[PDB]
Design a binder for this molecule. Sequence first.
Ligand SMILES: COc1cccc(N2CCc3cc(S(N)(=O)=O)sc3S2(=O)=O)c1
Ligand SMILES: [Hg+2]
Ligand SMILES: [Zn+2]
Length: 257
Amino acid sequence: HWGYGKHNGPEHWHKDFPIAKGERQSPVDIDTHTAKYDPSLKPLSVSYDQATSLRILNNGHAFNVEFDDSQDKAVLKGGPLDGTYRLIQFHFHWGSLDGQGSEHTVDKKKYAAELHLVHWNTKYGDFGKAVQQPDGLAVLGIFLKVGSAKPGLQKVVDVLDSIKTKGKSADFTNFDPRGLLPESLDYWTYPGSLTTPPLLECVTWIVLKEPISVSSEQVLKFRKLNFNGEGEPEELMVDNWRPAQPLKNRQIKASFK
Ligand SMILES: COc1cccc(N2CCc3cc(S(N)(=O)=O)sc3S2(=O)=O)c1
Ligand SMILES: [Hg+2]
Ligand SMILES: [Zn+2]
């Protein structure tokens, strides 16, 4: 199956998922100088006050916190979006070293990790239908830089022991995702795809300008996860990120100057 190793990594994906060579693939490098400031861009509206977290799980690719998306409990509106998008889950991509880990880069600069809050367009009924549409998903990308500890991230860090290997999960209720947002909601936006197979081109990427900082020990705990299931040879979960793809016939718009 696909993964991030030499034999099943990104450079092999196209064989099983041809869309990997598509026209709007992610991530991409955000070139601040050629990004077009757009005044008609509305401010972002993240309403996560009623968010209901359910569980956290290691899926062999990354760890994911799933939310109850049965109702409009945590939605994203505004920005370049037309419609309400529901939060279904969030996950991270991180590196084996502090200078790599994020998927999107800024002027070729890589961050230690990158948080993706995944939302789907409610006008489509369910996530399954949303992934069949060019505007089916909206992923909020947030960069993580090493520095001071991020208090809202510690709850996730503590529970990682219980989900060390692929297939493990644990109840993770009452988690407030607002604890992971930076102060400013300024962003960049462009049409892209999922960064892992099936690599579907249904995503409106909203990448925040301002990164959040997390301590080295917090990201350290991320690296102690396992790609493998229990009983198999241990393989540390690190560098679960895909390299930048060519922008092609696309323009990155900024909501700020
Ligand atoms: C039909 O397509 C499906 C069905 C079920 C699951 C998925 N996903 C897994 C891959 C993947 C990669 C994401 S990233 N890094 O681009 O945010 S979000 C995401 S997903 O929605 O959780 C996709
Ligand atoms: Hg799509
Ligand atoms: Zn992701």
